[PDB]
Amino acid sequence: KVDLWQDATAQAELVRSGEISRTELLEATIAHVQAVNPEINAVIIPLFEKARRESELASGPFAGVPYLLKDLTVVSQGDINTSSIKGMKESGYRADHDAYFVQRMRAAGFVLLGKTNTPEMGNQVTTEPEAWGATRNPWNLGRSVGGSSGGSGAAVAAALSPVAHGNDAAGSVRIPASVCGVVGLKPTRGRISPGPLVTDSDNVAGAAHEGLFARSVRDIAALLDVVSGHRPGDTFCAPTASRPYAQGISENPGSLRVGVLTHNPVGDFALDPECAAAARGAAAALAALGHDVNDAYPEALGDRSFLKDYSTICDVAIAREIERNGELIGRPLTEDDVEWTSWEMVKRADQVTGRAFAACVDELRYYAGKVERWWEAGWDLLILPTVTRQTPEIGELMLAKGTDLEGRQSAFISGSLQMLAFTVPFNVSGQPAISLPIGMSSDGMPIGVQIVAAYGREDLLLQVAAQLEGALPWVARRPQLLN
């Protein structure tokens, strides 16, 4: 009975130290998964046999430590790959190779334990796909786990693994992290390779980033050191750090110019008071730490007109993704293979011209510029809530096949919009953004606090995150699912 609440670094040490065996840790983890996962449906594709095989051969700073992979974008050789598409799940399709991410983790000593749930093609901010069923929150089984990397977020929150992979296009790593009370990082655009495959139309024109889940800031730093770097064909790239993140995390950044946002600058909905208060509390802690904290934010955040352009790009991305998956199994996918919301985008995609698509991408670049100018002006970090509302109940965000969306993502309207309004701007700017599990709602649901740093500055981000982790430690808290 190993203490699975220890982070990856600690679990790696227990093995290295010899205090516990690789098979002990793995088997202890597998047992825990078999007992807890049925209740939350986080891990949809178990890979225990592979995990056991890799465990014997594993070597590195994290040899023997298990990890979970989202069933989207990145793939593992010879394993089921559904992307939560009904037609794909039924085909029994299996990937033919390892994504660079997977190779890097294995070389580091990690053992692939399985794949986590996600909405179809990661097209929702909740994880309730028709193909695998809903993933439930370890903190409250009747609540959503956010999305699209909801499976990985819940898995880490329930200790099914100390760390996990996920991707973020509108906040898909940060959102589930906030909702599930774990640390979720969307690094600088181009930091982590999603290759060798080229998916989602150049990863949604760069808006889609591979990201990381963990329960400690040091685990994130170590993960970055493992999966970062330019790989062949990678479209985007990030500025190079001078030293490994595992090392720089303890450096003192000194007093930084910090801006705090505790209201919705767009003014189209009220920021939940509890979400705002969590960010406010974090800002206060930073002020006590000696940082120059002020109420300020990039003026560009007051405008979300770019989301329309982003939606158009997403329509094309999903449409072509449906095509790519069809080619994988050898037959075109039909309206009967995917969810209605996904097929809707296929229709909309047909109305998009080449010039229109190009114009939408330019809109993203221009908005990214307006956002980054705030940091250019001297500001170092922006602190704001990761999400803007209380966590929705299961079934709340999934719309009936008869809903009148009308020319726009279902995740970009009403209840879903409030989940991603404070995260999507940074998918566009490409700046590193991390969600820290610093808050809790009055009814016991995790509330994440987001920190955003300048393009390429994960070093400063992790440094300040480590400071907040020390000032407002969250490790003491555990979901009810774990008693």
Q: Which residues are catalytic?
A: 70, 148, 172
**What are 471's two structure tokens?**
């000032």
What long-range pairs does 468-476 form, CB within 8 A, spacing at least 24? 468/282, 468/285, 468/286, 468/436, 468/438, 469/216, 469/217, 469/436, 471/285, 471/288, 471/289, 472/281, 472/282, 472/285, 472/438, 474/181, 474/436, 474/437, 474/438, 475/5, 475/215, 475/216
**C-alpha span between 184 and 172 (Å, rounded):** 9
Grouping H, G, I as helix, E, B as strand and the rest as coil, residue 433 is: strand
Contact of 8 with 135, CB cutoff 8 Å: no
- State the Cα angle at 171 between 305 and 301, rounded to 5°: 35
* Residues 392, 237: Cα–Cα separation, whole Å: 35
Encoded amino acid at 47, one letter: L
φ/ψ of residue 343, rounded to 5: -65, -35
**Cβ of 396: how many Cβ atoms within 10 Å?**
14
Question: Amino acid identity of 289?
Answer: L
Q: Which single residue is written with the structure tokens 């009967």? A: 336
Q: Which string of DSSP letters, residue by residue, matches 159-223? A: TS-SEEEEEESSSTTHHHHHHHTSEEEE-STTSB---SS--HHHHHHTT-EEEEEESSHHHHHHH
Cα 368 to Cα 192, 239, 365, 382, 426, distances in angstroms: 19, 17, 5, 15, 8
Do the beta carbons of residue 19 and residue 89 sit within 8 Å?
no
